[PDB]
Design a protein around this motif. Sequence first.
Motif, PDB file in Angstrom:
ATOM      1  N   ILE A   1     -10.034   0.943  -4.003  1.00 49.99           N
ATOM      2  CA  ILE A   1     -11.312   2.000  -4.121  1.00 49.99           C
ATOM      3  C   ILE A   1     -10.650   2.746  -2.528  1.00 49.99           C
ATOM      4  CG2 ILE A   1     -13.418   3.224  -3.244  1.00 49.99           C
ATOM      5  CD1 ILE A   1     -14.761  -0.017  -4.469  1.00 49.99           C
ATOM      6  N   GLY A   2     -10.054   3.682  -2.725  1.00 49.10           N
ATOM      7  CA  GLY A   2      -9.178   4.934  -1.634  1.00 49.10           C
ATOM      8  C   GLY A   2      -7.693   3.901  -1.631  1.00 49.10           C
ATOM      9  N   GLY A   3      -7.907   3.516  -2.595  1.00 52.77           N
ATOM     10  CA  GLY A   3      -5.808   2.439  -2.405  1.00 52.77           C
ATOM     11  C   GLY A   3      -6.170   1.192  -2.064  1.00 52.77           C
ATOM     12  N   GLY A   4      -6.942   0.978  -1.705  1.00 52.30           N
ATOM     13  CA  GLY A   4      -6.698  -0.171  -1.004  1.00 52.30           C
ATOM     14  C   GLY A   4      -6.407  -1.322  -0.455  1.00 52.30           C
ATOM     15  N   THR A   5      -4.957  -2.018  -0.317  1.00 50.01           N
ATOM     16  CA  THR A   5      -4.021  -2.002   0.997  1.00 50.01           C
ATOM     17  C   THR A   5      -2.274  -1.779   0.417  1.00 50.01           C
ATOM     18  OG1 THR A   5      -3.893  -4.641   0.661  1.00 50.01           O
ATOM     19  CG2 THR A   5      -5.602  -3.880   1.887  1.00 50.01           C
ATOM     20  N   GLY A   6      -3.060  -1.505  -0.424  1.00 54.83           N
ATOM     21  CA  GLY A   6      -1.236  -0.975  -2.130  1.00 54.83           C
ATOM     22  C   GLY A   6      -0.729  -1.913  -2.764  1.00 54.83           C
ATOM     23  N   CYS A   7       0.250  -1.947  -2.310  1.00 54.01           N
ATOM     24  CA  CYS A   7       0.744  -3.378  -3.551  1.00 54.01           C
ATOM     25  C   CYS A   7       0.733  -4.698  -3.135  1.00 54.01           C
ATOM     26  CB  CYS A   7       2.189  -3.008  -4.126  1.00 54.01           C
ATOM     27  SG  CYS A   7       3.389  -2.353  -2.754  1.00 54.01           S
ATOM     28  N   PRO A   8       0.950  -5.691  -3.933  1.00 54.30           N
ATOM     29  CA  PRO A   8       0.298  -7.808  -2.916  1.00 54.30           C
ATOM     30  C   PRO A   8       1.798  -7.778  -2.362  1.00 54.30           C
ATOM     31  CG  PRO A   8       0.572  -7.502  -5.560  1.00 54.30           C
ATOM     32  CD  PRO A   8       1.302  -5.821  -4.807  1.00 54.30           C
ATOM     33  N   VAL A   9       2.850  -6.641  -2.719  1.00 50.47           N
ATOM     34  CA  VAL A   9       4.087  -7.500  -2.125  1.00 50.47           C
ATOM     35  C   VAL A   9       4.310  -7.118  -0.937  1.00 50.47           C
ATOM     36  CG1 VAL A   9       6.770  -7.608  -2.422  1.00 50.47           C
ATOM     37  CG2 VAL A   9       5.162  -8.654  -3.988  1.00 50.47           C
ATOM     38  N   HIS A  10       4.758  -5.216  -0.448  1.00 51.08           N
ATOM     39  CA  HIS A  10       4.896  -4.687   0.169  1.00 51.08           C
ATOM     40  C   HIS A  10       3.623  -4.580   1.405  1.00 51.08           C
ATOM     41  CE1 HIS A  10       7.943  -4.383  -2.319  1.00 51.08           C
ATOM     42  NE2 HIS A  10       9.062  -3.915  -1.829  1.00 51.08           N
ATOM     43  N   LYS A  11       2.601  -4.660   0.688  1.00 47.81           N
ATOM     44  CA  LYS A  11       1.450  -4.050   1.254  1.00 47.81           C
ATOM     45  C   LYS A  11       1.451  -2.963   1.724  1.00 47.81           C
ATOM     46  N   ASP A  12       1.869  -2.290   0.588  1.00 52.13           N
ATOM     47  CA  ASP A  12       2.065  -0.324   0.610  1.00 52.13           C
ATOM     48  C   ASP A  12       1.438   0.546  -0.010  1.00 52.13           C
ATOM     49  OD1 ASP A  12       2.942   2.857   1.262  1.00 52.13           O
ATOM     50  OD2 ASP A  12       5.249   1.742   0.551  1.00 52.13           O
ATOM     51  N   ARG A  13       0.963   1.559   0.093  1.00 51.48           N
ATOM     52  CA  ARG A  13      -0.111   2.296  -1.067  1.00 51.48           C
ATOM     53  C   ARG A  13       0.996   3.445  -1.106  1.00 51.48           C
ATOM     54  NH1 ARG A  13      -2.979   3.235   3.099  1.00 51.48           N
ATOM     55  NH2 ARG A  13      -3.515   1.105   4.018  1.00 51.48           N
ATOM     56  N   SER A  14       1.626   3.417  -1.008  1.00 55.22           N
ATOM     57  CA  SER A  14       3.246   4.301  -1.596  1.00 55.22           C
ATOM     58  C   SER A  14       4.025   4.055  -2.129  1.00 55.22           C
ATOM     59  CB  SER A  14       3.059   5.765  -0.332  1.00 55.22           C
ATOM     60  OG  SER A  14       3.929   6.892  -1.308  1.00 55.22           O
TER      61      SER A  14
END
Lengths: 284, 284, 284, 284, 284, 284
Positions: B201-214
């Motif tokens: 929800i709201g993008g969470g914290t991004g990808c599990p590897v980078h913690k980047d939402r973009s």
Amino acid sequence: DFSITQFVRNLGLEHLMDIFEREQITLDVLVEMGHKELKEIGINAYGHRHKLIKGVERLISGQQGLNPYLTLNTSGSGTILIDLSPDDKEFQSVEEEMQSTVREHRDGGHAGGIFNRYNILKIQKVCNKKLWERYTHRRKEVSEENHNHANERMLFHGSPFVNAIIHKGFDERHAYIGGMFGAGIYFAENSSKSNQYVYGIGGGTGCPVHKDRSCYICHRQLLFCRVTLGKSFLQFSAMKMAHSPPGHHSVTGRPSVNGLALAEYVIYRGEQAYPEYLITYQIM
Amino acid sequence: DFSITQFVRNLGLEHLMDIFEREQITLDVLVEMGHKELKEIGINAYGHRHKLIKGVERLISGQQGLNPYLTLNTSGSGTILIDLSPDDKEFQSVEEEMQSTVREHRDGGHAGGIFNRYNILKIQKVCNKKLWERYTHRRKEVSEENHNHANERMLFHGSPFVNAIIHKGFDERHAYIGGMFGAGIYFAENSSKSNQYVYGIGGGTGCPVHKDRSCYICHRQLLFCRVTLGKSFLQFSAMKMAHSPPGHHSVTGRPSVNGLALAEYVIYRGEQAYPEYLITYQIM
Amino acid sequence: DFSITQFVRNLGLEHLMDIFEREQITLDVLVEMGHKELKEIGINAYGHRHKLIKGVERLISGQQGLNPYLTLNTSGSGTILIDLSPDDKEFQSVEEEMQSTVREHRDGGHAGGIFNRYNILKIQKVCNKKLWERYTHRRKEVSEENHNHANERMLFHGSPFVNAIIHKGFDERHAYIGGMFGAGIYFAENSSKSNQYVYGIGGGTGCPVHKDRSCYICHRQLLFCRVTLGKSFLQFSAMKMAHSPPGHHSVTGRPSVNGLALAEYVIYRGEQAYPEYLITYQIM
Amino acid sequence: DFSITQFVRNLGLEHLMDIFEREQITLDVLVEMGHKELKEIGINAYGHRHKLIKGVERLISGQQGLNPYLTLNTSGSGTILIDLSPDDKEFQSVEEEMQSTVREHRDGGHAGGIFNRYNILKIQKVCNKKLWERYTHRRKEVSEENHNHANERMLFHGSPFVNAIIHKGFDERHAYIGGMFGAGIYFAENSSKSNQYVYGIGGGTGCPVHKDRSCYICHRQLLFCRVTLGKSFLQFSAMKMAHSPPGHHSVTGRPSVNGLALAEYVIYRGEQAYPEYLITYQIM
Amino acid sequence: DFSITQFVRNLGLEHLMDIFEREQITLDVLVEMGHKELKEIGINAYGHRHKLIKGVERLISGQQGLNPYLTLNTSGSGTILIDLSPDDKEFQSVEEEMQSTVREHRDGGHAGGIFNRYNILKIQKVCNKKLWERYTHRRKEVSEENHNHANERMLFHGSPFVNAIIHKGFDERHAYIGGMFGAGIYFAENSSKSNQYVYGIGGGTGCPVHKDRSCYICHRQLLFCRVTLGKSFLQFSAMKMAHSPPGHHSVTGRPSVNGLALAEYVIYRGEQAYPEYLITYQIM
Amino acid sequence: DFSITQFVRNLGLEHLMDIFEREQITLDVLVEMGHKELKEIGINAYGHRHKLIKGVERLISGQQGLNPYLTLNTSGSGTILIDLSPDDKEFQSVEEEMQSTVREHRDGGHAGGIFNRYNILKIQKVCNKKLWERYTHRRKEVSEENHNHANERMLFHGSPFVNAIIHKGFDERHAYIGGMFGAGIYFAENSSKSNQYVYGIGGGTGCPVHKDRSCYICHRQLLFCRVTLGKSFLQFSAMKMAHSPPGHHSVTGRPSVNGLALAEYVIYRGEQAYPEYLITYQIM
Ligand SMILES: COc1cc(-c2ccccc2)ncc1C(=O)Nc1ccc2c(=O)nc(-c3ccc(C(C)(C)O)cc3)[nH]c2c1
Ligand SMILES: COc1cc(-c2ccccc2)ncc1C(=O)Nc1ccc2c(=O)nc(-c3ccc(C(C)(C)O)cc3)[nH]c2c1
Ligand SMILES: COc1cc(-c2ccccc2)ncc1C(=O)Nc1ccc2c(=O)nc(-c3ccc(C(C)(C)O)cc3)[nH]c2c1
Ligand SMILES: COc1cc(-c2ccccc2)ncc1C(=O)Nc1ccc2c(=O)nc(-c3ccc(C(C)(C)O)cc3)[nH]c2c1
Ligand SMILES: COc1cc(-c2ccccc2)ncc1C(=O)Nc1ccc2c(=O)nc(-c3ccc(C(C)(C)O)cc3)[nH]c2c1
Ligand SMILES: COc1cc(-c2ccccc2)ncc1C(=O)Nc1ccc2c(=O)nc(-c3ccc(C(C)(C)O)cc3)[nH]c2c1
Ligand SMILES: [Zn+2]
Ligand SMILES: [Zn+2]
Ligand SMILES: [Zn+2]
Ligand SMILES: [Zn+2]
Ligand SMILES: [Zn+2]
Ligand SMILES: [Zn+2]
């Protein structure tokens, strides 16, 4: 009443004709009978049944290029109308979809009259096997061209030629040539928008008895139709085209920027619609 | 192989066991075999075949209350993913649907990221007979309740639990509790709108590897799903509800009043959706 | 009647004759029966069926040079007329083609009569398997010689020997020796042009009963035939030839340089036409 | 090859994977294999074959609505070009048809150039199963509407998008919008008339290299196409129409009222034509 | 060899091209190869063979109406000439027939020259599968009309177009228009009678080198041909007819009332004769 | 060597001609070569061998009615003579049979000369496959008519036309028309009885050189022949017949009722004898 006689005589089995006379068996009926049925009607000898079946196969498959089967299988075709009971849930659903889609139009009810709701007298399901098969073949084509999704909707259609449509189907050769989106067949989500066209473009000359576009006495007819849209091109401005835009299967227009107005759709192939329901109604 | 051993020994036909051992005949295979197949594998005596078929009938039909058949047919159930070829028309249609529906969002690429186009790595067809049958049964129900129209659509869905969905289906017990329309399953016409929810929800914290939402490196997964809407209720304001409004089967809303934004839909029953396509992609 | 008795006696299976008497099995029927059918009629022993099938093989293939198969399969041959229903679309199409191709002629209806339209009493489809196979074999030949295109049309033919044509086919040995293009079989696009020849060349002596070429009472018959043209030679002036020009398969002429007059065609091989429809009509 | 791996693992038959790997068995191959073929590749146990066949049935038929078979059957589709032999009679027939129909045009060779003969470099047969099936389905429909007659012709077509046509078929959504008879697909009996449109309307700007409309070096490409006309409406004056006239399946017109000019035809549905031959040539 | 390249690429089997390149497998060869042959050339995986065979089936049968097989199967067609050995009995029989049928003619050797004997340089057998199959099909057709008797004869034919006949067959479109029995193809039992036509009607202008109708140096060519007469009409006077008399398949005449003169025959269909032997000779 | 050149050119395989020219491959050799032999001579590509073998099939079997194989297979036919070794037992057996059957005759050596013994110069075995197969086919027939017994004997034949017999076989069209038993072929168990006919009937005039019927210098020739008698009719008196008596296959007579005189036989069909040994000898 004589093709059966010639067929039987050509095989040397005229002595069977009396049986075929009592059972009212014609060639169209005969071509669909196997050993079991012939045994039932009284053809007891195996040799006679074998001869009849071989003759039928030589007629139907031996001369397929002449298509005798189509010549024989015309009976039973055509359209029938099945009346929905008012108490049935299907009738209620159709009536609710008709009534809840009335809305005010920019014209002061000039084309279709002034009213807020309908009075439904009956709803009929239209059954025609050949037309339905044409529609389903086209729907499968479009599905295969649109990632397995036909994008099928249930829309409204108003026409002074409703009878011709139900008995022959939708035809792009009878399209609304002067339409705002070109020469196509037009469907409306709003019931009143389609009702506007029941008596002709712009309401025509109204009812044929009183020439009143707002007649509250003469019966009116609408079609609630199953329409395949496929990939629908969304058009915002007026543009006249003869066929669908490349890569698309229909056109969607939303003339009203905001409000309660629903969408309108145009298809440029008659086989992409089927008139499932015929609604008979008055306005109030 | 002990189940078939006990079944055959009970019938007094243990001397046939060698045959069943060479042909790898398990009880789940046996319960589906008739005279023709048993003759094929070498049960030449009619008496033995009769005894076996009578025993299978005594077990399957004679104790239907225990449903031994269901406990025997667990083999073959499960999901398979069939890769679409990039050169095929289906792949091109789905990719065009993904690409043509991208748009900007109120947030400056906060949840989904900043991009104008995707890089499609692969698209897979999701095949699961049990889930498909559940969906088809519900669709038939809704059609019967909506004047023979399912109102089916193809809509995007983003979720961090794609694997659970493709192996177990859509569940209303795993609904979006905090959704603006209440506890239901949400679908979007815009691929970017669902991409916003890929990581949470709201993008969470991004990808599990980078913690980047973009992140432009990590692979993302989206579902293009078959959704049965039936009679949808039009919603213009947030309303927390648990189920569909009375007489309706889904809810449709448009948070963006006007612009390139498309509609969003909510179903309050998991069986009313099916995850047809699984798309793997990167943002660019 | 005695053929099967001799055949069965020669095999030492006369004890089976009673069965063949009850099932009306003749030699022509028997030569088409395998193990399954013989078992069906009650020949239970495998040895008897084996002997019968071997005897049939010895007769049919062992003495193929005598062609007994043809001698046995004369039954079922011949022509049958299947009557089209007036309400059918095929009947309407044929009647419209007949009625819409009437035109004025240089002679004031001297050969055909004074009329502007017909009165169709019935239309029949002519079915003859041997003639159809002859036609399709020739059509395949011509297609192979004309870049895979038969150049097939539907054209009218008038003749006082319609019955002989429908029962025996078109025959260039009965060609119109005195025709402007030579000794061939002549077809017309205009139905009135063919009607001019219904009672003979130049109208003959009119109807048999009243000897009136413009009789409005006597029934007339026309053929609407499938004609293979292949590579057709365009001729502008009268030229008497016996066969097609080298490298061509038919001749087309247009005696009238302008007006509603349509083309006329000539074939020099009788197998290049098939009389598909027989039309019974009056003139008005 | 993971689709078949998942499918086999779901059935508990992973021990067979070795065989499927050595024989290059993919799921699309597997769904077409019965007991005989599976026995051929070494699946000797009857139970294993039974499980595989039942799984294939549960996928292809159990989930027919998902159309997994179409997903698996995209291989082999597409167009192949088979070169004709210049010494063969088919090539000679096509070349003679191309050469014998050259003529002069109202413009002194402004559009197509100045020439009286061609130099044929090669002729190819265009083979595409899906397009051919679409064409034959439409041809059957038209014949059934036209007293069992398709009214099929072979006509020339010139277009700068010949590659798109031979790979995707004829499309009325790519019709000649500004044509004299409206928005349709146009065919000519004269090869020079179609040659006038090879580089565009009015000859366009000539060849892509020399920008010359009469280039004698650059190769041109024409199509010799199978066109179903059905009932063809005869047109004498220009009329802009979007579809066929009611009751007709095409339009035929003759801009030159007399002389050596042949007919021109218009179809308003792309499925009514098939590009049978692709001709590469130079003008002389 | 790009046809097989396209075919193999469409199946996803381009990695096999190397094999097809080394074994010189063209598409025409490939469409005739099953599992056994494909295994011979090193296609060891069953899946690859399965895909290739299914593709060939989809081409040859799936698009039968396009006749790709006939396009691919033009190689090897055409005529070959097999020289007979002068020491064999076939050559001796043909030569004896040539020599023993010489006779004097009404004109004193004006047309064919003056001689009692020939010098036979060579005799050749003419082999052409397509022409032979056409001849045998017609022979079967005639036999079925003449109580299982073709009435086949061997007759001489002289014509300045022997090469065209041996390569394209006898053609009634190149009949002897001015002959005494009409426009047909003429054959003689006397070799000298046919020798009178080797250079044209009435001998033409003799050999092309000396312009001498009685040249003893220049080589002449006669045809000794298989001719199907069927039911032959006996003619005693000159009668110009375009086709056979009704019910007959040829005409036979005897211009000389009695003496050493043999019969002469006329056929009016080119497929009723086959040029079996080509005789090269000189008059002495 | 042009037949194979035409055959190979028609297949488009002229680049292989070099190989066929070095290996001396003619068409008659080629029609007997499979994949193995073609690989042996250096045709390494599978496609080329496939094309050659298909062409051979289309020639030999496709045009069987023309019998190209018989035209190609005349080489190797004809007779060979194999000399017997005078030290071998076959020669000794033949010589013993020749010497031990001499006897005296009613005339004092008038026709065959005066002698008690012969001087055998050589004995040869006559080998001709066509004649041997004719003889063995007839022998099979006669055995099947005579309870599986040919009744085959070895008998002497004397004739001034021994060369014609050993090259063309025995021929009842060259029967001894004036014989006591009619017009048949006569054989004797006594070698001197046959020697009486070596120079003609009654000895003729004698040897060609000295015109002596008892020449002791000139070489004579006798045949020792395999004669099939079947069921032989015993004739005791002279009776002229043209064929065998009904139910019989030969006639046997004993002109001398007692003494050292053996039997004489007459056959009436040339194919019932084969001339196995040719004996060259002098009378002493
Ligand atoms: C796509 O639809 C529109 C779009 C825009 C637009 C304009 C600007 C921007 C964006 C959009 N303006 C108007 C229409 C419109 O006309 N829609 C409808 C809706 C229902 C029916 C209907 O029920 N029936 C007939 C009918 C039927 C038969 C015939 C005849 C019998 C005359 O052929 C004529 C009209 N036409 C409709 C037409
Ligand atoms: C009806 O839709 C809306 C309406 C309004 C509105 C507001 C005011 C007035 C009028 C309308 N505002 C927002 C939304 C909205 O959020 N729509 C979407 C669109 C796509 C997805 C999506 O692809 N995925 C998940 C998802 C998936 C999984 C999960 C879990 C709970 C499994 O983590 C949560 C949300 N939600 C969506 C939600
Ligand atoms: C190619 O056709 C023509 C061309 C020209 C011409 C003249 C100059 C320039 C350019 C063209 N003039 C006349 C004709 C013509 O005669 N056309 C037709 C049209 C229909 C029928 C028809 O339906 N039936 C019989 C029939 C049938 C049977 C018999 C008999 C039974 C007597 O054998 C005789 C005539 N003849 C036709 C003949
Ligand atoms: C029915 O035909 C006509 C009738 C009259 C007429 C006028 C008055 C009275 C009576 C008759 N005038 C002109 C035409 C005509 O234009 N005929 C052709 C003939 C061949 C081609 C052709 O080979 N190709 C393209 C093509 C192909 C592709 C394209 C695109 C749009 C794809 O670039 C455009 C035109 N058009 C033709 C058009
Ligand atoms: C039935 O035959 C006759 C009958 C009577 C007769 C007259 C009265 C009463 C009773 C009988 N009079 C003459 C002939 C006759 O002409 N017989 C032949 C015999 C052999 C050939 C032949 O070998 N070749 C070409 C040939 C071949 C090619 C061409 C072309 C036209 C290709 O140059 C012309 C003639 N004609 C023959 C013609
Ligand atoms: C069955 O044979 C006889 C029976 C009676 C008889 C009379 C009364 C009662 C009971 C019996 N009388 C005479 C003969 C007889 O003539 N026997 C032979 C025996 C050997 C040869 C022989 O080796 N060769 C040629 C030969 C061969 C060739 C030719 C030709 C005609 C080719 O020159 C003529 C005779 N004739 C034989 C003829
Ligand atoms: Zn009214
Ligand atoms: Zn990342
Ligand atoms: Zn009358
Ligand atoms: Zn250029
Ligand atoms: Zn000369
Ligand atoms: Zn001597």
